Amino acid sequence: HTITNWSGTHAVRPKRFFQPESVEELEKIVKEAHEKGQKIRPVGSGLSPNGLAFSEDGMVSLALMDKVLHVDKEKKQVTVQAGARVQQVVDALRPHGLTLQNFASISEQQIGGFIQVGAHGTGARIPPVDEQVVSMKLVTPAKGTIELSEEKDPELFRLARCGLGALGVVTEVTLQCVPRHKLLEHTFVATMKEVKKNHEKLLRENKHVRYMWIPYTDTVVVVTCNPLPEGKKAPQYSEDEKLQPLRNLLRESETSPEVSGLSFTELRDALLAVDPLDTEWVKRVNQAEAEFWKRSEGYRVGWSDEILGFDCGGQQWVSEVAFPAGTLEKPSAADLEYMEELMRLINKEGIPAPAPIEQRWTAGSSSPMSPAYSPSPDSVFSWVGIIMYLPTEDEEQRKAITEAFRQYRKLCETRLWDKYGAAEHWAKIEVPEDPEELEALRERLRKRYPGVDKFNKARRELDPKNILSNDMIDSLFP
Ligand SMILES: Cc1cc2nc3c(=O)[nH]c(=O)nc-3n(C[C@H](O)[C@H](O)[C@H](O)COP(=O)(O)OP(=O)(O)OC[C@H]3O[C@@H](n4cnc5c(N)ncnc54)[C@H](O)[C@@H]3O)c2cc1C
Ligand SMILES: O=C1O[C@H]([C@@H](O)CO)[C@@H](O)[C@@H]1O
């Protein structure tokens, strides 16, 4: 049984692979692996871009433990087995009139894997998902099955719920839901100047805001979503006219066959496949994409779970950092300054950077390991995601792009992250081979994360034989 991540950038053939159907079966596996000193890294859907959950030695999946256990109608709360995919939870909650406060760009993540990395959506007043956990059960190699909440060892709770699978196997999570509700989604394009003008008010007056930045253009795609006051309503280009700049650029007879079945994101892939690391060509692809978005202005209505998802396109390298951008009441220009510099940087160095650079916002988290950890609840973090696509399975083309991206992320590390106090998404952080880079990263982590000594303390205590951790965890936290 091989496990491969979403983008096929990491795979693992674990010597031992468990898939219990019950807590009792899980408890027994962890007791025996404790006794025998055998590795058992928790794995959810295995999607993490950086293979965080992977172990050559042993992995345990709770995929078969995926029921909604309890819905507290009054407090709008759901208790669910960790192996439930976010999508299974949404479907289950449908009849009870509830949804999650936020969704990621996909919903194939297990609830366990979702909370253990502090995954997030967008909305300057909405925390990452780890802040939405009211309680959890956790099978530990030292103390068996323990229960954590604000009431029950609140300090361990806040450490554990965003634990990177290093503190125990989550079996059960209770989540603070909200009423199931429709969103009105408004997509429109702006210039940086137009973005700057309205930004401060836009974040604060719209429930969800997302900017898709298009390198080597002055097109920013703005997507706002707000609840629809019950029974409210809402140029207009065909699909063929929207896709026309991309089809014309690919065909370069008058027409296009086979191509016409390709979606917007499949066209971008086929276009980048042509000369992925040629900047002049990527400038041409990003311009064609800007034209597509300019022809895609308008409104959509759907349940929040349908609206808050995004087509992320083909296999890819991603890097996403969270950095402080003030609070609700004291705005910071840092989120827009970061993007100015990032665009200036990409031109300065001729980076063949495709679109989009995704920019989102979350409220702060009380979880000490959250990239958006803050002591103040009304802090605001901007998250900025850079991307390079792997549009084919040409092993040589994928190697060149892997290196291209390594240097792109490396230029953001050296020039921006320290300056802006940026922390890497736990599912997207890669471990340097160069020990100078590796020490540098550990130094960066001690800077971002003050409670790192408490995380290792909690590991010694709950996982003394260290069967829950892999080379990644040990290399990041020694
Ligand atoms: C296309 C795509 C889009 C994405 N969009 C977003 C996004 O919008 N926002 C965002 O924040 N993230 C996003 N991600 C990242 C994603 O949410 C995380 O990688 C998430 O951790 C994946 O869930 P999983 O079930 O695959 O977890 P895995 O990768 O399987 O595991 C993640 C972590 O959880 C631990 N773990 C898993 N199950 C358990 C358990 N039961 N008990 C204890 N520890 C456990 C693992 O050991 C590991 O540390 C995206 C990823 C992809 C590929
Ligand atoms: O990992 C991730 O990839 C998505 C990306 O493809 C956006 O262009 C992003 O939403 C998510 O965090």
Residue numbers in the entry: 10 to 243, 248 to 265, 281 to 506
Give verbatim excerpts from the published study on this entry.
To elucidate the structural features of GalDH and how it interacts with its substrate, we determined the crystal structures of the viridiplantae ancestor without (1.9 Å resolution) and with L-galactono-1,4-lactone (2.1 Å resolution). Soaking in a substrate-containing solution led to the bleaching of the crystals and the resulting electron density clearly indicated the presence of the bound substrate. We, therefore, conclude that the crystals accumulate the substrate-bound reduced state, outlining the structure of the Michaelis complex. Upon substrate binding, the movement of a gating loop (residues 337-344) constricts the access to the active site, creating the catalytic cavity. L-galactono-1,4-lactone adopts a pro-catalytic conformation with its C2 carbon at 3.1 Å distance from the isoalloxazine ring and C2 hydrogen predicted to point towards the flavin N5 position. The surrounding side chains establish a hydrogen bond network with the ligand hydroxyl groups. These interactions are enforced by the closure of the gating loop with two of its residues, Cys340 and Gln344, moving closer to the sugar to interact with its 1 and 5 oxygens. Arg388 and Lys456 critically position their positively charged side chains in contact with the substrate O2 atom, confirming previous hypotheses about the importance of Arg388 for enzyme activity. In particular, these residues may promote the binding of the alkoxide anion of the substrate, which in turn facilitates hydride transfer from the C2 position to the flavin N5, leading to substrate oxidation. The resulting 1,2-diketo product will then spontaneously tautomerize to the more stable enediol form of vitamin C32.
